[model samples]
Target chain A: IRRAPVLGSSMAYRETGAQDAPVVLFLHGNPTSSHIWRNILPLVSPVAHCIAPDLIGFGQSGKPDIAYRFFDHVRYLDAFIEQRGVTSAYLVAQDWGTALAFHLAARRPDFVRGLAFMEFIRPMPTWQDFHHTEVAEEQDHAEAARAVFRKFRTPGEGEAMILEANAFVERVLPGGIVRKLGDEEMAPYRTPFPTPESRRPVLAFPRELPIAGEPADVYEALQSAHAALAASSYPKLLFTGEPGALVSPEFAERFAASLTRCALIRLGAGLHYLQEDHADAIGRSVAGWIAGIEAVRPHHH
Target chain B: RRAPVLGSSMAYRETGAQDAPVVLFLHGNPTSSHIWRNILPLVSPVAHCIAPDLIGFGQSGKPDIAYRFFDHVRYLDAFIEQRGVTSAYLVAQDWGTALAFHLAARRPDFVRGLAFMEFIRPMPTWQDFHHTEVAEEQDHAEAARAVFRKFRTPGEGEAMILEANAFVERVLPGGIVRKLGDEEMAPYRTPFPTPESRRPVLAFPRELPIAGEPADVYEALQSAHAALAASSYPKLLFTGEPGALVSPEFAERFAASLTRCALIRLGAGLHYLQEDHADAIGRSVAGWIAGIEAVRPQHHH
Candidate 1:
C-alpha cells in the first residue's frame, strides 16, 4: 500500500505494473479499502497500470477529522490523483468510488481517457425512473434495502449501530454478499477502526446514503457529477448486474441511452459490488474495452 | 499470498512462530478464512496457525473454475504443499470441516488430531435430511425445497446469489445469533463483489443433503467418516445446541463416528458458531491440545 499526501490527509493506494504504463484507476465504496480490487489488479495489470485507493476516511488511508460527506471524498480524491501525477487514465469504480470518479471526470474531463463502472449514484431518478416498470415490478428489494438504509440514516439507532457496533462492516457489508467472510479475512477491514472513536468516518458514510431530500451537500455534488458525466461525450462502459439495489436495469438502460458513446454490458448476475463477483470478467472486459477504445481513439490517453 | 496452485493465486493468512507445531484452520463455503480469525490469535502462541482463503473467496485470487467440493480440496492440497505444511493439528468449521475430514482421511500420518463443527455426516439419506427445525419451520420442508429450487434454477438462483447476494446478506445473518458487525461481514462480502465471484457460494448448498451432494463428494465424505472412526488419533467436535445444521441426531451420529473424540455443546449458537463462541472454542481447543500433549509426548511431530 502506498500513501500520497492530499488535502492535509494521506490516501492509501495499491499500484501495480509500470509507472508510465497506461493507468487503469480503481475506486471503492464506503467502509471498504483498496483491498476491494485485489482480484482485479492481476488480470488488468499486465495490460495497464492498476491503481486502487482507499477513500479518505476508509481503509489504510488517513482518517481526517472532517465530516466525511461526499465533497470531502471528492476533494481528497482530486488531490490524491494530482499528487500521484495521474493526468489521464481509464477509471473503474463502484458505489462511492463511482460517484467520486464521476465528479473527477466532470470537473476535468480531459484528465479522464475513458470510463467503466457497475454500481454508481446518478441524480435520483423520477417516479417514472426510480419506480421503472422492471424495478417496480420486482419485489421491494430496493425499498427493503432502503428501509435498512433508513435505519442507518436515523440518529440514535444509526449512531449506535455504526459507531458503537460498526454495523456497516458487521451487518450491511455481509448482508450484501452471496458468500460469507471468515474472521481471518475480516481482520484487515477491521484494522482501521479498533474503537468507536476511530469509527467516525464509518459513521459519516451512512448519513450520506441519499434519501429523498436529505444531505443537501451530497445531493448537490451528485447532481453536479451526474450533469458533468451526462454532458461529456467520453467513451463509457456501464456494467449492470441483475437485481441491482442502486442501479436498476431500467435506470441502467436510461443512463446508457443518454451517454454519447457508452456501452452497457449486462453482466449475467451481480448486485451492489459488481466488481467483487465480476472483477475477472470485468478486468478482461475492461482491458478489451479499453483496447477497443484505443484502437479507434489512438490519441485519447 | 498468491500461490500458483492450479494456475491461480490461492490467498491465505499465517500467524505465530514458523517452527511451532502447525495448526491448520479451514473454513466452509459462503465464508472464507475469516471464520478462524478470533480463534487463531488465541492458539497462535502454542501453534503455527494457518488459515487460507479458499479459492475464489476472501483475499485469494479468484480463478474462473468450477468450485466443487473436490475442487476446493485440490486447491487446498496445493495451498498446503505451497506453504510447506507437512504435519498439523486440524480445526475446521462448516464446509471447512468437510474438507478437513477428507484431508485427514487421505493423509492420516500428516494430520495429528481433528476438531470440527457443523459438517461430517455418515451418509445423509432423504429420511435423514427432512428431520430438522429448519425444515419444519418452512411448510414441512416445502420452503426449504423452494429455496433449493430457487438456488438451482439458473436465472432465479443467479439473481438471488449474484444480484441480491442473498446467502451472505440474508441467510448467514439469519443463521448466526451473535449479530455480526460491518467489519466482520465486509471481508465475507469482499471476495464476492460481483455475481460471478459468488459461484463458490452458489456451489456449496448444492452439495448439502437438500440437493443431494454429488455422488463423488458423498462417497468421499462417507469414506472420510469411516476413516475418522477407525483412526486412533485424538478428535474434538463442537456443536450448537438446537438450531445448527448439525442437529442433535447429527451430533450423536458424529460422536459415534470417531474413536477418541470429545463433543462440546455450546448452548446458545446457530450454524456459524465461531462468531458467537470463538473465545470458548479457542480456550477448549487449547486445553484439549495440552491434554493430548500430556498423553502423547511423541506428538511433537
Candidate 2:
C-alpha cells in the first residue's frame, strides 16, 4: 500500500506497470474501494501505469472530520491528480466515480487523454429518465430498488440499513452482481466502515443523488460538465452491461449518441457491480480502447 | 565473439570456415543473434555464418544515443568494416532487411546476394497500412497496423515496448503457433532486464517512417527499396503464414518484380521464420547461396 500526500491527508493507492507509461486513474463508487479492481488491473498493466486510489474518507485514506461533499471530493481528487502527473493521463471509473471523472475532464480537458466510464452516472439529472434503472423491465425489481434507494435517502432508516446493519457492504454489494463473492473477497470492503460514524462517506453519496433536481448545487456542477463533455472532442468509451441493474441499455445508447467521438462496448452478462461479473471483458476492452485512441493520435503524418 | 564498433562492444555469433563465402545474418527487434541460434547451426556447415546482436540490444553496448535508424546503420557499418569483410552475402529478417538493403544500395559490388523475410517496408502513409497492402480476410497484418500506430505514438510506445516488453513477451511468441519453452525465451528476455535498457526496442518503431514525419529515415528506406528494385544480384524472399509485414501474396509480387529473386514458401511460419521453419529456411538458403556463388565464384577471391 502506497500513500500520497494530498491536501494534508494521505491517499492510499495501488500502482502497476511501467512508471513512464500513460497513467490511468481508477476510481470506485460509494461503498467500494480500489479493492474492486484486483483482477482487472493486471490485464491493462502491460500498456499502462494503472493506478487505483481509495477516495478520501474511504478505504485506507485519512478520514478528517469534514463534510464529504461533492466539491470536497473534487478538491481532494484534484490535488491528488496533480500530484500523479495529469498530463495525457486517462481515467477509468465506475458508478459515482464517473461523476468525478466527468468533472475533471470537463474542467481540464487538456490534462486528460481520454475517459472510459462504466456503470454510467447521468451527468445531468434531467438527462436521465430512470429512478431505479428501468426501460421496460420486470417493474417489480425497479419498484423494489426505488424503495431501497428512498430508504437510504431517508436519514434515520438509511443509518439503520447502511450503518447499523452494514447492509450496503454486506448484502447490497454482493446482491448487485450475478455471481457470488467469497467471504475473503468481502472482508476488505467490510473493514473500512465498521461503525456508524465510519459510514458517513458512503451514506453521503446516495443522499446527494440529484433526483428531481433536489441537490441544485450537485446538478449545476453536473450540468456544466455534461455540456462540456458533450461538446468536447475528447476520446470516450462507454461500457454498458446487458440487462444492466443500475444503468439501462437504452440510456447508455442515448448517452453515447449525445457525445462526440464516443465508442460503445457491451459487456456480455453483467449489471450494477460489473467488476464482479465482467472484469475480464472490462479490463481487456478498456486496454484495447486506449491502445486504439493512442494509435489514432491527431496531428500525425 | 566481441568486437569494437564505434567505441562500444558488439557481440556476434560466428561459425563455418572463413575460406567459404561470408553469409552475415541480421535479426529483428527485441531479439538478438540468438534468434538465428537454431538456424545458424543448420546453415553453418556450408558457408561462413555470422550473426551479430544489434547495438544497444542483447550483449551489445547501451550508449546514450537516440538509437535511430542512421545510428544503427553507422554502428553496423563499423562492425562490418572492423571484421575486414569487403564482399558478403546477407541473410536478414525484420530490421535487418532494411540494413542489408541500404548496404547493398550504397555498395552494389560489395554485396553479392540478399535474402530477407518479413521485412520492414515503410508505408507511404499510416492509412496505407490497410490500403497499401492487405489480403482480404487476413488478421495479422492489419492487427499489427493498429499496434504500430501505438508504437509510433510517443509515451504509449514506451509503455508497450519498454514497460510491458510487449515485443519480446507477446510479438515474438504470438507469431509462432508452436509453444515456446522458457529456456528458448531466456535469450530474448536477457537483452532487456530494465526499461532503461530497452531504448532500441522502442526507438525502432518511431524511426519507422509512416506519413513521412521523420523525413531522413523515410527517404533512407525509400532509397533502400528503390535500390532493391534496381539490383540484379542473386536474391531470395522467404514467405510465411502472413504475420504482419509480408504475406505470401506480397512476397509473390515482390519476388516476381526482382531479377534472380526466388520466392521460397516455407509453410507454417510467421514473422520469426527461424523458429518453426528453421530447417526449411536453412536448407533453402544454403542451396540458393551455393547456386548463386557457382555462377560468379571469383568475387570473393
Candidate 3:
C-alpha cells in the first residue's frame, strides 16, 4: 500500500506494472475499500499501470474533515489524479466508484480516456424500479433486496443496523458476494473501522439509494451524467451480474443504451459486490477489452 | 452540569446567582455549550447564564437517537424542566435559533425574550428561503446554496457530517472570524471521537427549511413559524456584514415579521458572531435585557 497526499488527506493506493504505462485506475465503493481490487489489479497490471485507491475517509487513507459527499469524492479523486500527474486514464470502477466515474468523466471528459464499470450506481426514484429484473432468477429476490435497501434508508433502523451492529461488514459483505468470505479475507476490510463510530462511511452509502427521489443531489447528478456520457465518444464498458442487487438486467440495459460507445457483458451468478466473486474473470475481461480499444485508437502516454 | 433528561444525560454549564433573572445561551451545529464559553462569563456577572451541550453532542451522553428537530426539542424541553428554568432570555445562534424558536413558540410563557444571530427556521413560505435573492448575489450566494443543498441531501450530507465532521471541523471554523487555538477546538471535536458519534451533526443539516424537509418537520416548523409571527415578545437579531448566511435584506424582512424586534448589524462579525465579537454580543444582549426590564418590569426583576 502506498499513500499520496490528496487535499489534506493521504489517499492509500496499490500500484503495479510500468510507471509510464497507460493508467487503469480502479475505484471501489463503500464497506469494502481498496481490498476489492486486490485480485483484479494484478491481472490488469501486465496490460496497464493498474492503480486502486481507497476513497477519502476509508481504508488506510487519512480521513480528512469532509462530508464524503459525491462531489467531495469527485474533488478528492480529481486532486489525487492531479497529484499523481495522471493526465488521462481508463476508469475501472464499481458501485459508488462507478457513480463517481460517471460524474468525473462527464464533467472532465478530457481527463478520462475510457471507463469499465460493474454494478453501476444509478439512483432509482422508487422501489418500483426493481419490480422487474428482466432476469428470471433475480425476480424472486427483488423484494428481499429492496427491503434491505429500505431498512438501510430508514433513520433509526439504519443507525442501529449499520453503526451499532456494523452490519455492512457483518452481513452486507458476506451476503453480497456469492461465495462466503473467510475471516482472513474479511479482516482487512473490517479492520479500517472497528468501532461503531468508525463505521459511518459504511452507513453513508446505503442512503445514497435515492429512494423516492429523497437524495435529490445523486438523482440530479445521475440525470446530467446520463446526458454527458451519451454525448461523449469516450469508449465505455459495463459489466452486469446475473443477479445484481442494485443494478438488474433492465437497469443495465437502459444504462448501456444511453451511452454512446458502451458495451455490456453479463457475469453469471454474481451479486452487487461482483468484484469479490469474479475479480479474476472481470480483470482479464476488462484488460482484453482495453487492449482491443487501444489497438483501434491508442491513448498517447 | 449533568442532568438526566431522556435516554441520555445532558451536560450544561451555569454561573452567577441562581436566583438572578436567567439568561440562557444556545449554541448551534458543530458546536456545543463550549461556544458560549467566552460570552457566558461576561453575561454571568450580570445575570444567571446557562449553556447546555445538546444530547449527542459535547460531553452529553451518546444515546442511539436520530437527533432530529423534534428529538432536539424534546431533550431541550426536558432539560429546562429538570433545571426548573421556567422563564429566561434566549440568546441563540445557528441551529440554536431554530430550537429556541420552537420552545419560545410552544411554551410562550416559559421564554422571556429572544436574542439571536443567523435567524433560520420559521421559514413560513418558499420565498423566505431567500433562494432568488441569494442566486442574484452571484459569488457568495451560489457557494452558500450549493453547500446548503449538499447538507440537505441524504448521502452527501451523511458523508460530510459523519465522515469528516464538516460542521465542526470546516463550517464552524470557516464561520468564525477569530482563529481558534487547539485547546479551544479540542472540546468541540472530543465528543465526536468517531464517525458514528457524529450522528447528530448529520441529522441537523437535513432539517433545514428546504424543499427536501420531511412533511412532519415542515408542519412542525410551519406551526412554530406561525406562532413566532403571532407572538408579541421582544426580539433582537444580530447580523454579520454582507457575506454572512443571513443577509441584510433577509434580516430586515425577519425583523419586520416580529411585532417588537431590533436588528443590529455588526461590521466585524461573521456567521458565528459569538466567536468573533463575544464581548460585544454579551454587552449588547445585557443592554437589551435592561431595555426589556425598563419597558415591562416583572415581579422577578
Candidate 4:
C-alpha cells in the first residue's frame, strides 16, 4: 500500500491499471483497505486506471482526530478525490464508499463519469412489499447475511468480538467468502489494525451503512443524489455477486429499473467481499462494461 | 410466543388462566410477543396472557400491506374483535403503548386497566423532540431524533431497518441494559429474514408522529391522555433512566393528566424497559392488574 497526503489525514492507496485509460476509482468500505481490489483490479487495470484508497484511520491511512462518522469519511474521501488531480472518474465502489459517491456525483456534475456499484444500498418500499429469493439456500443465505450485519452493527458486543476475535479481516472477511483464503492473503488486512483504537474506524463504517437510518444526514443527502443520478443521462454498472452481503438478487427485481440506464452484471457464486472469490470475473465483466460506457461517452483528458 | 392464529393474520403466544380476564401484552415497534417473554411467565398465573406479533412482525403472516400505523391498528382491531376474549388489562411498551392507548381509547368500556412504559407523548414535533424537553440524557436521546428522522425517510430508513435489521439488531438490544445474546435474539430474528421482510419494523418509525404530520394518530394518542385522567380504569405507568419517550419529566407531566395511572419507575433503563426491568415492571404490573376488581374473579376472597 502506498500513502497519499490529502487535506487532513493521509490515505493508503493501491494503484494498478492503465494510467492512459479512464480513471476508475475503487473505494473500500468498512474493515478492508484498498487491498480489497488486489485480486480483482489486476484484470481491469489493462483497460482502466484502477485507484483504490484505504480510507482514513484504516490500513496505512493516518488516524486523524476525527470521530470517523460517515460524513467524516465523505469529507476526507471527497478531498482525496480532488487531490488525485483528476477532473472526474468512473467510481467502482461499495457500502459507505457507494454511499459517499452518490452524494459526490449529484453535487459535482461530470465529476463521476459513471458509478459501478458492486454492493449498493438501495431504497426499498414498504416492509410488506419486501421478499426473499425463490431459491432455497440463496434465500437463507441472504436472510442470514442480514442477521450477521445486525450483530456487527451492535454496540458493546460488536466491539467485544473485535477485541478478542481480531475483528473483520480475519473473522468476517474469510467467513463472508465461500472460498477460504490462505494466511498469506489475510496478512495485508490484519497488519493495519492492531490496537482497539486503530480498530475504531472498522466498527465506525458498519453503522455508517445507514441501515438503521442513522447519520440521517447521509440518508437524506443520498436520497437527493440518488434521485438525480437516476434521472441523469450517464450509464451505471451494477455488479452483483450471488448471495451478496449488500447486492443480493432481490436488488435486481427492486432496483434494476429504478436506477435507469444501468446494466446488471452477475458475478456468480460468491458471498460479500466477493472480490476475494470472484475478482477476476468481476474485472473482466467490469472492463467490458467500461468499454461499452467509453464507446457511448468517450473519456477526454 | 410462537404459533399463528387469527387466521394467520398474526401470531400470538398465551399462557395463564384461560378462564381469567385477558391481560394483553402489546410490544412496541421492532419487537414481538417475545418481548414480553420474561414478564409473561411472571403474570400468567394471575391473568390470561396474550402477546401477538403484528401483521408484519415476528411469526405473523407476511401480507403485502403498507404496514403503517393505521394498518396495524386496523389489523389489531380485527384481532381484538375476533379474539373477543373479553380484553381487560393492557401491558404495552414503545409503539405498543400507542396501539394499547388507541385500542383503549376506542374500546374504553372493555379495557379495564393499562400498564404502559416508554410511551411517546403526543409525539413532540420534529422541532420539539429535536431540541427541547424529551429525554433525561437530553443529548443522546436528542441524538436519536436525527437517526429517527431517517427512519421515516424512504431509502436510508430501509437500509437500516430492512437491510441491516437495525430494529431487532440495534434497537431491540440497545433499549435493554442486560443486553441480549444471539440465543435470546433468535425469535426476534425469525420474522425478519430479509430487508423486504422487515416491513413492520421499518414502517412503525415512519408512522411515528413527527412534527405532527400523522394527524389522526396524534389526536388519538392525546385523546386518551385526557380521558385516562378521569376514567374508572386502573392503569400503571413505568419509566426508567432517561427512557425513550417517557422521560422522568414527561412521565410526571402525563401522570398529572393520567390521574388514574399508577406511575412507577423501573429505575435505571432506556427504551425497552421490559427487557431490562421486566421483573420489576412485571411485579408491579402483576400486582396492579391483580388489584383491578374488574379482572378478578367474583369468588375471590
Best by lDDT: 2
- RMSD per candidate (Å) reads 23.3, 22.7, 27.9, 26.5
Query: In model 2, where do residues sit more than 4 Å from their true spots?
Result: A123-128, A131-135, A298-301, B1-301
**Backbone clashes under 3 angstroms, per model:** 24, 0, 3, 9
Cα RMSD over interface residues, candidate 2: 22.4
Query: Which has the higher DockQ value, candidate number 1 or candidate number 2?
Result: 2
The lDDT values for all models are: 0.74, 0.78, 0.76, 0.71
Give the distance in Å from residue A36's predicted Cα in candidate 1 to where it truly belongs. 0.5
Q: Which candidate is the best by DockQ?
A: 2
Q: Write the per-residue lDDT of candidate 1 for residues A1-301, one digit (tens) a residue.
A: 8889888879999999777668888988878888878877875674478888888878888877888887788778888888988889989888878888888887788888778787777555442233233545565765566566767778888888888888888777766555565677567878988888788877787677554545776777778888888787776777777766578777787888787656666555666767666665566556545533442344497
Q: Arrange candidates, best lDDT first.
A: 2, 3, 1, 4
Stretches > 4 Å off in candidate 4: A1-301, B1-7, B127-136, B294-301
Model 4 TM-score on a 0 to 1 scale: 0.47
Interface quality of candidate 1 as DockQ: 0.01
Give the C-alpha miss distance for residue A61 in model 3, angstroms: 1.2
Model 1 agreement with the true structure over B103-180: per-residue lDDT tens digits: 888998987778778774644554354346454444634454567567867678888887899988987786688778
Give the per-residue lDDT digits (tens) of candidate 4, residues A110-144: 78777777666544332211223556666665566
Q: How accurate is chain B of model 3, given as a TM-score from 0 to 1?
A: 0.91
Query: Tens digit of lDDT per residue, candidate 2, span B1-301?
Result: 8999998889999998788779999987868998888777645644789888889988988899898889989999999999988888899998899899999988999877887898877677665553335446345556778898898888899999889989888888987768778899888899899888988999987887678868898898899889899897777777786545676777888888976575666677777877887755665565455434323312797
Give model 1's TM-score versus the native structure.
Answer: 0.48
Question: Who is ahead in DockQ, 1 or 3?
Answer: 1
Per-prediction TM-score: 0.48, 0.52, 0.48, 0.47
| DockQ (CA atoms), all models | 0.01, 0.02, 0.00, 0.01
Clashes by residue pair, model 3: A67-B159, A67-B160, A197-B196
Model 3 off-target regions past 4 Å?
A130-140, A299-301, B1-301
